[PDB]
Symmetry: C4
Subunit: 444 residues, 4 copies
């Protein structure tokens, strides 16, 4: 219709500008509540320009498409747009837009009272535009997760230091008795003096109790600050148990790859020590785990067991398709038979001096050497050698279909392919009875 | 029999009222132990009305059915009811009901002594009605788990602040020497003065050491408070290691859905970067993981692999039964053959521009388009198109039973069904040899 | 041979007595190092009786069998016993037995010096008998794990409070300058006075910094205590990060059963809300998860998938063997055919009003009602009913071997057995072609 | 070519020497920044000898092979070596080598200024040689993981104590007002006195706030130290939430073997208590879990399900190959038939008095006794006995191919082999129709 979708450029840059008017309007919202208690006319225009840019956006979000939850498609219908916005965030977001301190200055008051500037704390209710941006950026795959989760953990404590260093200056500044307050016991005057733009003393108190260091030079004196310190030191129990529990969740997400690798190396050194294995086979099982971690990641088979059928079969056709193409065992065969390279477990990456195929074995699989070198041997000491692109196991459908002639083992560092009795024995039926003819030509 | 079962309304509202008489009777139980040490006749009637409502419930729970543990059925037998209650919570719950301070006032005493009002601390033994309600509400599926586990974590610390701010006023109030106590060193009188209903000073001390802030304005002076601070600061080691360990368990339960999603996106970007994949296939595997998370949740296949046989087969008959009904390949077929839509993996939700079926493939499955659109193509650039309810893979049991004619790929956002060679090839035997006749009519 | 095995009664009660002489000899080992610096003749006999009971056990452990690591059998050979004990714990355990303070009093000294009573700190090296008992009791299945792991966490901190409250009294008691120490700044004399058997002041200092409360009434004054507080406050970083990390491991072991239950309920309420399921099928899938948790535990199928072959088949022969015995479909059949009740998935426990078998289905399984009641119905509203021990699905090998006549659904609370086409169709071969004869007699 | 590979001995010992010149050059880098503010000529030669050994290594790393990331092979090409080093760590590592304090002494200055010795803090940028050594040693399997991860956790806090105890002495030493600083309020002079080589006071302040103990004897006085304490106490929130989250990760890696063992024992005692099993079968299922943990580890089947095909088949040929060799059922058979001992589940280790084979069962497997003893019995009380190397189940391919004659059960402690109907029934095809002849000879 005549509705703008909630995507680029005239809306995802307007929404990024209203975030900068929430970070500002949640900094001066408890700061002018305590320190700058005049608010005559100097900052008065910025807090009304900003409050005007949040009245436009009440109008503007009756024209956004909102991306329906049960259909996963955009809704372009100005009635269902309207009933949704009027039921979730209209009675909440119009109570943060109507001016109480600027506009209702004209009735009787002087722009300052206790139960009249507390109504200006509803400009902290527009913080949901920032909290619903951290929820959106966590699922955006082009943004990091360790540096969004810590930005959410930093911005919460920076707001808890600020909003409780300005709520403990109001208890001291509005005490009818003399300086028997937390700041008055060491700095006896602290008013109309001591450089009001440097409120570092009020933040130094808040960081000392939120981190639970506690020096005791600033502490509660009157029973008004004993109530506030009880309600603040119960908040800091819940805060530091939330930062520690979140950083514990992040360290586990940090170091889970290197820890489950050191679990499987440990479990394969417990196995080769209980059974008193020789050193010549313990090195073959430990060099393989180290090379599987360097090359195949940690969970690669679980990664591409979730791709449906055609994302997986298109990965295996960019990868090693001209490897299985130009070998002699499939030469002059049709395109559609070498379009079944969909069960190649090509994640081999064998280390040097590792046996791929033993001397005699149940001949389960052929291997295709992608890059590297392999040296055949016979029962005591023989010598044959395969080159950098050949096949090393093709005598599992011929005169030795119950045995193996050589015992190959790598020399440099070799990547193989491992086609395993599902595309030569369990693929009798599709095409290519010609492959069994191409093998006997090489044996002359 | 004549026995009331432990369910609604005359028992699950009576049990909710005795919880409010435990929250009260665990607040004034250490409060009148220390501050209001008179207890002449003012609060005396409320602590005996409440103590009478706990004598009724000793009688009443000889008539409750209790829901046997090895049979999972209610026991209505007034003898086995009686032996169970007399062996678990009778010698414990009659020691919290007999009045020691009210009733044994009449022998010799004045209602106050050290070893006589400590016997009134057995009214803290009725706290098991609250602790066995948090265990019941955690397994009730109509109550939340993140806001029951934090209510249990708040009520434990609120009781630890209260019961140790009233046990450290008794050490100061009952010290025979003058004000060389923790409160006497700063407020030298603090007795018969300083507004006894405002005991905020005793809670301000307890919150300062339980959170381990520690200001040092209130500290131990005499060796009676040095013993109590040792036994209290060893409790706060075990308390804050229990709140942090529980909130770490809750944050892991909070953010496990978005963290294992960002693990699988990371593992599929490590795979497409080691193998140097082109950008045109990396976008197909990354847009699929993002859409599988939005629609199929996280573990949906593990959810409905635990439903037995008929909960699962009734889900698949409300869902997409008139989808597989009115298509041409099953038209005029019996009801009982299209009552085997029990292996439809209908959780497709394919993104736009994703290939469902390649050009040539092992023809494993037919697909039924539920909602969306799909455009067929030929080897270079062709064009055919399926509508919003048709079948896009039905040539896997006919003239191309070893191949595929088109290569379909989505355009809008499409949900499919994927019946896969278990209800057309491995269902030769039940019924419907007519389905192979309905296909040749559409090919004319 | 003539060797005692390391088991009951004359050795596992002697070893439990030497543990009580380690708990004692690790309490007075830093206590007489600092406070009771005389040690003339009063406690002198107990520290030599105890030191004699540890010289017997050097002799005695040349006659213990020790239970070999690679063979899991006891070694009774007094030579290999000897080489093992002489290589692990002989040069360590004879350095904790030879008396330096008692026995070498006779050369020149008065039983006290700095570099002579530090050699009596090697009586802390016999703590390995306690540390190797916590490792043994953790794998003993008749002892708890939550109350052994916390006893190890309590005994470590109780020793860290004691051994660092006695090492910070030696810095104050042996300072050549006057009372400008941590205790001397508030209690100026503190020597030959202030009730030496009450060293609570030295423990009150240690608990204040180990829990990191910190009051500042006792702090370091001289640069000897500034060095000790640096080496102690680096130990308390490693200590409280070890208690919090261990209690986090215990809370996860505490509450893993109720948390993964609330994960699977949540995942099945996300599934029934995205697909807009009716309320009459959402209650069937949610009442089943709640009853599977109450009765089948959490992981029962993973429990008895690890028992080898005959522990599992003997569980299923005590359980529900006279259930499958005396039914009509196996009546007059041999013992060895109803000795194949080894694939009965009897963990049914169906809730009320849950459908077991639909109206028409692939007839996969028969069910045997163990306890409860079941009511059959026909397509709209019919009525038949099975009793408390009958068979409800036996028409899957007869005239309806492609269908189902009724649609049973529970009424009370029912436990079933579910034999599923592996002991009636895939057991044609063993015995009992008579079972197909017993079915046609009941149909007359 | 003429290029040295990054391995032993002339490079992996040169790199270990430059680590000792980073540990030194990150200790005196903030130490001479604050305390030794002269730096005339005494330490001047060591900070230029060290700065010369880091100018050699800028030259030397244009000749190292670097082990390519996508090929896992060394690159010997002096052009691609050069473009890699010039793009990662050349503009970073030449800014830490050019002398600013020594070499630019000759222009105008006296070797000390604020914005001139801050440029000597770029000698902290050579710390990446230490941080990239902890990343390398974590994946080296010949080094431990619990004592590399704690060495990284100790070295971070030792640097945070040092670098913030020297940055808070510069605020006190360079304050133009008199001693109204943190150290000046208690030690009023502290300059040209109080033993400058003992800066323990500046570390005692830093350890008191980093561990959040907080005594209050040293606290901020001027508004320069109130800014530094805010920026430091926000760092200590992020530091102690990183040490606790890392030690929680290490304790879970510490005690995961004994915790999942106590989970499976608990889950098998919940199962044998709900079903009211007799004590004679509960002991058989609990003694088996305890012996499977002692011998088979925790995850042994998951260990050797990842070895490819020939590491696994060479483990089973060193292990129990002369066990299956010299038994009567395979005597005089070829080598290649007893080269298929690749499906032997030899991890039995049965406890005493445990039934291996019941009286009548589906005869699924034969067993070969490796070490131990086994006693046969008949239905009530019979007696036969197998020796220490015999076969105990071979009547599953003969006259009782639907039954079992004895019911063996162990007596001492027995390890078996369990060949299970895949090498006698599903190996009809390879060789050895002679094995069925060798069985009838033993039955005479
Ligand atoms: C130097 C100063 C300069 C800077 C000055 C300030 C600049 C401000 C700039 C703006 C900052 C942004 C502020 C808002 C950030 C957004 C916050 C947010 O999104 O947090 C939401 C968070 C939800 O949790 P999260 O982990 O995101 O959940 C994921 C799954 N939903 O939820 C939270 O935030 C949770 C926070 C934890 C709070 C714990 C409270 C525990 C309370 C326990 C009470 C105990 C009982 C007390 C009773 C005492 C009575 C006697
Ligand atoms: C009122 C008082 C009354 C009572 C008085 C005292 C009575 C004493 C009675 C005896 C008490 C028993 C004492 C011994 C108990 C046995 C201790 C034990 O077994 O602990 C071993 C434990 C091993 O760890 P655990 O988790 O058991 O391992 C499981 C897997 N192996 O290992 C541990 O213990 C670990 C302990 C943690 C220590 C952390 C140290 C961190 C160090 C940080 C660095 C310090 C040095 C820095 C130097 C660098 C300079 C910058
Ligand atoms: C206005 C301000 C004041 C307002 C006051 C309000 C009045 C209070 C209202 C009453 C309401 C609260 C009533 C009490 C709460 C009831 C909840 C409860 O008790 O829960 C039981 C809980 C069970 O544990 P949970 O983890 O739930 O177990 C799950 C699996 N069973 O178990 C627990 O809760 C366990 C408690 C944890 C404590 C652990 C600390 C013990 C450590 C001791 C260490 C000693 C070591 C000694 C070392 C010294 C060495 C020298
Ligand atoms: C007795 C005294 C003697 C003194 C001797 C001194 C000798 C020192 C010799 C040198 C010692 C080593 C120094 C270098 C340390 C080397 C280790 C290192 O840097 O490692 C990097 C480490 C990496 O992280 P790790 O978890 O290993 O990652 C694994 C997966 N990549 O990363 C880290 O280490 C991370 C650092 C810790 C994290 C700190 C978190 C702080 C964040 C909070 C900041 C808040 C900012 C607020 C913003 C306010 C905005 C207004």
């Amino acid at each position: 219709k005549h509705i703008i979708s909630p995507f680029n450029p005239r809306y995802r840059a307007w929404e990024m500008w209203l975030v900068l008017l929430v970070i500002y309007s949640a900094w001066i919202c408890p700061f002018q509540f305590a320190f700058i208690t005049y608010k005559k006319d100097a900052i008065f225009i910025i807090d009304n320009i900003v409050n005007g840019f949040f009245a436009i956006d009440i109008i503007l979000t009756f024209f956004v498409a909102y991306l329906d939850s049960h259909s996963y498609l955009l809704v372009d219908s100005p009635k269902k747009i309207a009933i949704r916005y009027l039921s979730t965030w209209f009675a909440f977001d119009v109570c943060s837009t109507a001016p109480f301190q600027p506009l209702s200055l004209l009735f009787n008051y002087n722009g300052s009272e206790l139960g009249f500037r507390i109504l200006s704390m509803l400009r902290l209710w527009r913080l949901r535009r920032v909290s619903s941006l951290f929820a959106r950026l966590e699922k955006d795959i082009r943004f990091n997760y360790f540096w969004i989760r810590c930005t959410k953990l930093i911005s919460v404590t920076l707001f808890a230091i600020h909003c409780a260093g300005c709520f403990n200056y109001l208890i001291a500044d509005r005490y009818p008795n003399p300086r028997k307050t937390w700041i008055g016991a060491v700095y006896p005057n602290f008013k109309e003096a001591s450089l009001w733009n440097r409120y570092v003393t009020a933040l130094y108190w808040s960081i000392t109790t939120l981190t639970t260091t506690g020096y005791g030079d600033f502490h509660a004196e009157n029973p008004r600050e004993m109530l506030f310190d009880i309600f603040f030191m119960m908040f800091n129990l819940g805060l530091t148990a939330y930062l520690i529990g979140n950083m514990t969740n992040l360290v586990v997400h940090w170091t889970s790859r290197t820890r489950t690798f050191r679990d499987s190396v440990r479990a394969a050194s417990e196995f080769a020590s209980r059974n008193q294995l020789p050193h010549d086979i313990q090195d073959q099982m430990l060099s393989h785990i180290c090379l599987k971690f360097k090359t195949e990641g940690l969970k690669q088979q679980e990664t591409l067991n979730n791709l449906p059928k055609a994302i997986r079969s298109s990965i295996a056709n960019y990868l090693f398709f001209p490897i299985v193409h130009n070998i002699y065992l499939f030469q002059g065969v049709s395109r559609n038979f070498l379009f079944q390279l969909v069960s190649d477990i090509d994640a081999e990456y064998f280390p040097p001096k590792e046996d791929i195929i033993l001397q005699n074995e149940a001949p389960t699989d052929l291997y295709i050497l992608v890059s590297g070198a392999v040296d055949f041997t016979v029962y005591v000491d023989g010598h044959d050698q395969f080159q950098g692109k050949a096949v090393i196991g093709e005598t599992f459908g011929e005169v030795g279909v119950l045995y193996y002639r050589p015992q190959p083992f790598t020399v440099r560092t070799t990547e193989l392919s491992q086609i395993l009795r599902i595309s030569r024995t369990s693929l009798m039926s599709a095409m290519h009875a010609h492959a069994d003819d191409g093998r006997v030509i090489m044996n002359n």
